[PDB]
Design an enzyme around this catalytic site. Sequence first.
Site, short mmCIF file in Angstrom:
data_model
loop_
_atom_site.label_atom_id
_atom_site.label_comp_id
_atom_site.label_asym_id
_atom_site.label_seq_id
_atom_site.Cartn_x
_atom_site.Cartn_y
_atom_site.Cartn_z
N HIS A 14 -3.16 -67.97 -48.55
CA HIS A 14 -3.28 -68.79 -48.79
C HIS A 14 -3.13 -69.16 -46.76
N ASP A 113 -0.15 -76.27 -47.57
CA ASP A 113 -1.20 -75.76 -48.54
C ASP A 113 -1.31 -76.93 -50.44
N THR A 135 -7.71 -74.11 -50.86
CA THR A 135 -7.94 -72.48 -51.01
C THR A 135 -8.88 -72.09 -52.10
N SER A 136 -8.82 -73.08 -53.04
CA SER A 136 -9.69 -72.81 -53.85
C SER A 136 -10.73 -73.96 -54.12
N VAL A 328 -8.59 -53.61 -43.99
CA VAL A 328 -9.46 -54.02 -42.51
C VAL A 328 -9.96 -55.05 -42.10
N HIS A 345 -13.13 -59.24 -56.19
CA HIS A 345 -12.32 -59.28 -56.88
C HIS A 345 -12.60 -61.24 -57.48
N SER A 346 -14.13 -61.51 -56.34
CA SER A 346 -13.67 -63.59 -56.78
C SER A 346 -13.00 -64.12 -56.17
N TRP A 348 -11.51 -66.40 -53.88
CA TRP A 348 -11.74 -67.48 -52.95
C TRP A 348 -12.46 -67.00 -51.30
N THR A 351 -15.70 -64.09 -51.47
CA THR A 351 -15.98 -65.16 -52.02
C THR A 351 -16.98 -65.69 -50.81
N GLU A 353 -15.98 -65.83 -47.60
CA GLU A 353 -16.62 -65.08 -46.59
C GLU A 353 -18.07 -64.22 -46.70
C1 LIG Z 1 -0.28 -70.98 -58.38
C2 LIG Z 1 0.06 -70.20 -59.32
C3 LIG Z 1 1.80 -69.57 -60.34
C4 LIG Z 1 1.82 -68.85 -59.76
C5 LIG Z 1 3.57 -68.38 -59.90
C6 LIG Z 1 3.37 -66.54 -59.86
C7 LIG Z 1 3.76 -66.11 -61.66
C8 LIG Z 1 2.34 -66.57 -61.65
C9 LIG Z 1 1.31 -65.16 -61.02
C10 LIG Z 1 1.21 -65.76 -63.46
C11 LIG Z 1 2.03 -64.60 -63.46
C12 LIG Z 1 3.70 -64.86 -63.47
C13 LIG Z 1 3.98 -65.02 -62.05
C14 LIG Z 1 5.20 -65.09 -62.40
C15 LIG Z 1 3.45 -63.89 -61.07
O1 LIG Z 1 4.16 -64.16 -59.84
O2 LIG Z 1 3.55 -62.85 -61.45
C16 LIG Z 1 1.55 -67.32 -61.52
C17 LIG Z 1 0.17 -67.78 -61.72
C18 LIG Z 1 -0.95 -68.05 -59.78
C19 LIG Z 1 0.57 -68.44 -58.97
O3 LIG Z 1 -0.52 -68.50 -57.97
C20 LIG Z 1 -1.28 -67.07 -56.78
O4 LIG Z 1 -0.05 -66.56 -56.10
C21 LIG Z 1 -0.29 -65.92 -55.84
C22 LIG Z 1 0.01 -64.48 -55.32
O5 LIG Z 1 0.92 -64.52 -56.25
C23 LIG Z 1 -1.44 -65.77 -54.35
O6 LIG Z 1 -1.91 -63.97 -53.34
C24 LIG Z 1 -2.99 -66.45 -55.45
O7 LIG Z 1 -3.24 -66.48 -54.18
C25 LIG Z 1 -5.50 -66.17 -54.39
O8 LIG Z 1 -5.53 -67.39 -53.59
C26 LIG Z 1 -7.01 -67.56 -53.55
C27 LIG Z 1 -7.17 -68.50 -52.96
O9 LIG Z 1 -6.93 -70.12 -53.20
C28 LIG Z 1 -7.51 -67.51 -54.71
O10 LIG Z 1 -8.79 -67.04 -54.50
C29 LIG Z 1 -6.73 -66.09 -55.37
O11 LIG Z 1 -7.79 -65.92 -56.74
C30 LIG Z 1 -5.31 -65.38 -55.28
O12 LIG Z 1 -5.34 -64.80 -55.89
C31 LIG Z 1 -2.42 -67.61 -56.13
O13 LIG Z 1 -3.60 -68.39 -56.70
C32 LIG Z 1 -3.79 -69.83 -57.02
O14 LIG Z 1 -4.05 -69.16 -58.69
C33 LIG Z 1 -4.65 -70.48 -59.39
C34 LIG Z 1 -4.22 -70.56 -60.54
O15 LIG Z 1 -4.65 -71.80 -61.25
C35 LIG Z 1 -5.00 -70.83 -58.66
O16 LIG Z 1 -5.26 -72.27 -59.15
C36 LIG Z 1 -4.93 -71.88 -57.04
O17 LIG Z 1 -6.06 -71.97 -56.28
C37 LIG Z 1 -5.27 -69.58 -56.40
O18 LIG Z 1 -4.80 -70.18 -54.80
C38 LIG Z 1 1.51 -67.91 -58.65
O1 LIG Z 2 -8.82 -55.30 -46.74
C1 LIG Z 2 -9.06 -56.41 -46.39
C2 LIG Z 2 -8.88 -57.20 -47.82
C3 LIG Z 2 -8.94 -57.82 -47.60
N1 LIG Z 2 -8.53 -59.20 -46.41
C4 LIG Z 2 -8.74 -60.72 -46.34
O2 LIG Z 2 -7.53 -61.49 -47.25
C5 LIG Z 2 -7.88 -61.98 -48.30
C6 LIG Z 2 -8.22 -61.77 -49.71
O3 LIG Z 2 -8.22 -63.47 -50.02
P1 LIG Z 2 -8.54 -63.85 -51.55
O4 LIG Z 2 -8.93 -65.43 -51.76
O5 LIG Z 2 -9.94 -62.77 -51.69
O6 LIG Z 2 -7.98 -63.17 -52.72
P2 LIG Z 2 -6.31 -62.66 -52.42
O7 LIG Z 2 -6.39 -61.57 -52.24
O8 LIG Z 2 -5.61 -63.78 -52.15
O9 LIG Z 2 -6.45 -62.49 -54.65
C7 LIG Z 2 -9.70 -62.34 -47.75
O10 LIG Z 2 -9.24 -63.75 -45.88
C8 LIG Z 2 -9.77 -62.18 -46.79
O11 LIG Z 2 -10.80 -61.09 -46.10
C9 LIG Z 2 -8.32 -58.68 -45.80
O12 LIG Z 2 -8.74 -59.46 -44.21
N2 LIG Z 2 -8.77 -56.85 -45.49
#
Ligand SMILES: C=C1C[C@@]23CC[C@H]4[C@@](C)(CCC[C@@]4(C)C(=O)O)[C@@H]2CC[C@]1(O[C@@H]1O[C@H](CO)[C@@H](O)[C@H](O[C@@H]2O[C@H](CO)[C@@H](O)[C@H](O)[C@H]2O)[C@H]1O[C@@H]1O[C@H](CO)[C@@H](O)[C@H](O)[C@H]1O)C3
Ligand SMILES: O=c1ccn([C@@H]2O[C@H](COP(=O)(O)OP(=O)(O)O)[C@@H](O)[C@H]2O)c(=O)[nH]1
Length: 448
Positions: A14, A113, A135-136, A328, A345-346, A348, A351, A353
């Site tokens: 994010h 965000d 961000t997705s 990296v 891991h897909s 966004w 993916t 990038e």
């Molecule tokens: C909305 C969210 C609410 C959230 C609160 C925490 C909760 C969890 C993690 C569920 C399990 C239990 C619990 C307590 C936990 O912490 O374990 C819950 C679901 C996902 C979360 O967002 C996610 O938070 C993570 C940190 O803990 C980020 O690292 C993720 O970002 C990353 O962001 C990327 C860009 O958006 C995304 O592509 C990637 O997969 C993701 O890992 C982000 O992804 C979001 O998840 C949502 C699910 O519906 C999506 O709609 C959003 O677009 C997406 O961004 C965090």
């Molecule tokens: O070794 C690494 C691995 C990941 N990334 C960056 O970390 C982000 C990961 O975002 P993504 O949405 O793919 O997944 P998330 O990690 O948030 O689930 C991207 O911009 C990647 O390029 C990086 O800079 N170095």
Amino acid sequence: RRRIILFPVPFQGHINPILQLANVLYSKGFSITIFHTNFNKPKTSNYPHFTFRFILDNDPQDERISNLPTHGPLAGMRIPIINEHGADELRRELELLMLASEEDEEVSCLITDALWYFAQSVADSLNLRRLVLMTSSLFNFHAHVSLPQFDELGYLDPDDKTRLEEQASGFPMLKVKDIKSAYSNWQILKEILGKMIKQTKASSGVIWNSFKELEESELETVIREIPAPSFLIPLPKHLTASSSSLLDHDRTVFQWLDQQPPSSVLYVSFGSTSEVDEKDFLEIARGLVDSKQSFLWVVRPGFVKGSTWVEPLPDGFLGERGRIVKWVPQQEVLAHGAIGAFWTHSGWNSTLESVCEGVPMIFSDFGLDQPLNARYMSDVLKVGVYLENGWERGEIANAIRRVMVDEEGEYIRQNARVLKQKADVSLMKGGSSYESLESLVSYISSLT
Ligand SMILES: C=C1C[C@@]23CC[C@H]4[C@@](C)(CCC[C@@]4(C)C(=O)O)[C@@H]2CC[C@]1(O[C@@H]1O[C@H](CO)[C@@H](O)[C@H](O[C@@H]2O[C@H](CO)[C@@H](O)[C@H](O)[C@H]2O)[C@H]1O[C@@H]1O[C@H](CO)[C@@H](O)[C@H](O)[C@H]1O)C3
Ligand SMILES: O=c1ccn([C@@H]2O[C@H](COP(=O)(O)OP(=O)(O)O)[C@@H](O)[C@H]2O)c(=O)[nH]1
């Protein structure tokens, strides 16, 4: 002069797109202030041209966040907590900054965000326009708005394990199993996603990290669901996110990549928060070895449950062709001539990038939006193969070879090259992304 305040979610996936957007807007003549938590802060010395203001996290900490873990799954609890309780402090910080503004300087807007739905009424209360950064993908937003239908059909019920391999009902781009993993955290997501949607539709404009030729099938949904203008800009085509890295870059990998033949190396990285069992970690190692391809594997410390980094891995296991590192500059690695494929891991950002650097993919997923990204890329665009049945070493090795070497995978490799070219073309004058960026700048300049 016109200032833009940006407010990211403090996680790598994010912070990266929002500071890419901040740089793009800075290049267009706006000054930039970043509101950020102390937690997971990026290196502010990398951004001499931005002003940072740290909020919501300051000492002494609220009883609600003071003891939340800084790593692992539960660090994300900060997102619901800040949404529930951060409004008053955000309003104070915005007013502070607006009060200190210079005379020829005005705050054009706040960009947050999409997950900070609480910021909409704060911005309204200040007569400040708020724009949302998604961000997705558009495809995932489309799925979110479809949740009521998904709910009705039983898809969201975890104990209903029936129609798993079927096409989803009036959403035939997905399989039922995709929806089930994407929304398995249903108790939390239904609340959060409903409010995210509502406050995104109430915003003054939505910026999507995408481009029209990537998600053409989804534009109609966005135009119909969101009254405000949408802008599709593929941020990794403007600049990499290396300056917002939260971890130290290894960067000893490029000397090693310089010794490999073109397109001979599989880049492997399963994200910034995913965790795996020892059993599956070792199975992934096996499949990588079995593939006979060179590989560069980013393993985040903590990726293995529950070793501190790769301890279960026998020393020297396999090979001369493989390397493990902690972190990296990912997009810069994807751009290197040696990379032939990306096992992701897909997430966004990863993916997109990979699409922007023309690297075809092998897809795994850890829920959230990841299974939908994997399904769309592998079945609609056809720029990768989805390992959608867990981790079996023989299937892993076949997927890697199909993308990287098999004649049968040439069309996937070629699709990825063409998709990169479409991304590049979209930034030329008259291209979709160039026009979206021109309209965004004009729009923001008018709010002022
Ligand atoms: C909305 C969210 C609410 C959230 C609160 C925490 C909760 C969890 C993690 C569920 C399990 C239990 C619990 C307590 C936990 O912490 O374990 C819950 C679901 C996902 C979360 O967002 C996610 O938070 C993570 C940190 O803990 C980020 O690292 C993720 O970002 C990353 O962001 C990327 C860009 O958006 C995304 O592509 C990637 O997969 C993701 O890992 C982000 O992804 C979001 O998840 C949502 C699910 O519906 C999506 O709609 C959003 O677009 C997406 O961004 C965090
Ligand atoms: O070794 C690494 C691995 C990941 N990334 C960056 O970390 C982000 C990961 O975002 P993504 O949405 O793919 O997944 P998330 O990690 O948030 O689930 C991207 O911009 C990647 O390029 C990086 O800079 N170095």
